[PDB]
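Ticket closed. Logging final result for conserved hypothetical protein TM0979.
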Amino acid sequence: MALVLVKYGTDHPVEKLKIRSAKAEDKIVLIQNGVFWALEELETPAKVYAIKDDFLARGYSEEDSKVPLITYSEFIDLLEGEEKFIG
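Final structure:
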């Protein structure tokens, strides 16, 4: 399996699926309900980032996320032909 979706909370790496498949040199983001990973009982060594707009749209505040809160546009830079961690 790939992990190319992060809009149902818990269905990609950051703070579980990551141990099963990640490295420190890995790249990930959270959106919609996927922002629920920024508040788990684990860690990442991979670059994680929630989508601020979706987190805001999920009734959170910017200090609530134990992960950085990027724009949809900062996410796009992480891709640019790395088309195996989307969502």
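The helical segments are 17-20, 52-56, 72-79. No further action required.
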